[PDB]
Design a protein around this ligand. Structure first.
Ligand SMILES: [Cl-]
Length: 166
């Protein structure tokens, strides 16, 4: 059994809410909680756009700017309003900061930069879905491991991001 995000062409595990381009019609057989996309490029594109919507916000709930990996991941993976106190959001931010080789409170973060967005998207995909080797698949030689470099690039291109090339 593949992870839910990969089965759904929704490797970010985006919850139903916005009618992203490339969604399947929702039916009685649909995933009850998470978006299902017709192709991986559409799911990857939606993930890049969601992260851009957070980054483009001036201020977070806590009153602080949204201009750092910590503040972007706080929006992406928010804690619950009540129930058991748990620090999954802090661990998630630290893990993505390691993927970017940046400190979580570095305010030079630019998610309009192709390479920065690529590393954050790929980090989230690998975090949400685990190792392809755990599902008896060969990982691709990249951060995300589930999708080819070409599949990641097509998602990001569709989200408007420009990789400088020679
Ligand atoms: Cl790059």
């Amino acid at each position: 059994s593949l992870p839910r995000g990969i089965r759904n062409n929704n490797p970010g595990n985006i919850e139903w809410g916005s009618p992203w381009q490339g969604l399947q019609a929702r039916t009685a057989a649909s995933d009850p909680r998470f978006c299902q996309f017709i192709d991986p490029a559409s799911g990857i594109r939606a993930l890049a756009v969601i992260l851009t919507t957070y980054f483009d916000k001036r201020k977070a709930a806590d009153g602080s700017k949204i201009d750092t990996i910590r503040e972007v991941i706080e929006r992406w993976a928010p804690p619950k309003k009540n129930g058991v106190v748990e620090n999954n959001t802090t661990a998630y931010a630290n893990q993505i900061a390691r993927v970017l080789n940046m400190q979580p409170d570095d305010e030079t973060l630019n998610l309009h930069d192709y390479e920065t967005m690529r590393k954050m998207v790929e980090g989230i995909i690998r975090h949400e879905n685990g190792s392809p080797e755990d599902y008896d698949r060969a990982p691709y030689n990249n951060i995300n491991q589930w999708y080819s470099d070409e599949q990641i690039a097509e998602g990001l291109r569709r989200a408007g991001l420009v990789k400088p090339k020679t």
